[PDB]
Amino acid sequence: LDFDILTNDGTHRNMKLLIDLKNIFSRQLPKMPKEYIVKLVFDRHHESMVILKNKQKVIGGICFRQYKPQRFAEVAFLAVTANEQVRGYGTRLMNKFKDHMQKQNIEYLLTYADNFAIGYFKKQGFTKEHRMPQEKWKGYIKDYDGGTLMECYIHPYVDYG
Amino acid sequence: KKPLDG
Numbered sequence: 001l002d003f004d005i006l007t008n009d010g011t012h013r014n015m016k017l018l019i020d021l022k023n024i025f026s027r028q029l030p031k032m033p034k035e036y037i038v039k040l041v042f043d044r045h046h047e048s049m050v051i052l053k054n055k056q057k058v059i060g061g062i063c064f065r066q067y068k069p070q071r072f073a074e075v076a077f078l079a080v081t082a083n084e085q086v087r088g089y090g091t092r093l094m095n096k097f098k099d100h101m102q103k104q105n106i107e108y109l110l111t112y113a114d115n116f117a118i119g120y121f122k123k124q125g126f127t128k129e130h131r132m133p134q135e136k137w138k139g140y141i142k143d144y145d146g147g148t149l150m151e152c153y154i155h156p157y158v159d160y161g
Numbered sequence: 162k163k164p165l166d167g
């Protein structure tokens with residue numbers, strides 16, 4: 001059970017894992033155009049941290065994009081495969097993600113959420129009220145009126161993990 | 162992050 005960063009480096013090994021992850025995303029996020037998930041998962045700007053069981057099996061993951069200069073990252077997709085849910089993996093993944101983001105000198109996590117997800121992200125520490133200057137993400141993160149923008153502050157020395 | 166009533 002490892003939580004590794006996975007990126008499109010063009011190798012058969014990583015590529016397969018990214019596809020497996022992409023397939024989990026689509027099955028777990030039916031309202032999302034599959035081709036859209038594909039585009040973000042394999043683009044130059046996005047990265048994926050995956051939950052790997054004994055070295056060759058993706059059971060979950062989180063695809064995100066860092067805006068280094070700005071020191072914030074947007075969560076694009078998050079999911080755990082059906083037969084592995086309710087085992088605490090999704091929470092350990094988020095914890096692992098925040099710890100990694102902290103080491104990456106990232107100050108805030110932003111993610112759009114809707115319906116049930118808002119409550120889920122509140123449990124992970126995300127809030128509707130942003131302490132981060134709005135003009136910091138404006139122009140980098142698309143502004144959608146139909147979605148609730150949520151943020152999680154990553155304190156430099158709070159232990160997430 | 163589509164999650165509509167998931």
Ligand SMILES: CC(C)(COP(=O)(O)OP(=O)(O)OC[C@H]1O[C@@H](n2cnc3c(N)ncnc32)[C@H](O)[C@@H]1OP(=O)(O)O)[C@@H](O)C(=O)NCCC(=O)NCCS
Pocket residue numbers: 028029076077078079080081084085086087088089090091092117120123162163164167
């Ligand atoms: C959100 C998600 C990653 C959580 O992963 P997980 O491995 O199941 O997470 P955890 O078990 O650690 O989650 C803990 C909570 O989720 C609830 N949960 C997750 N899947 C569930 C299911 N199928 N049935 C009932 N409860 C479920 C747990 O009951 C628990 O409630 P609590 O926080 O009050 O104790 C997973 O449900 C998923 O892939 N969902 C579909 C995709 C999605 O909506 N992603 C986020 C938005 S893009």
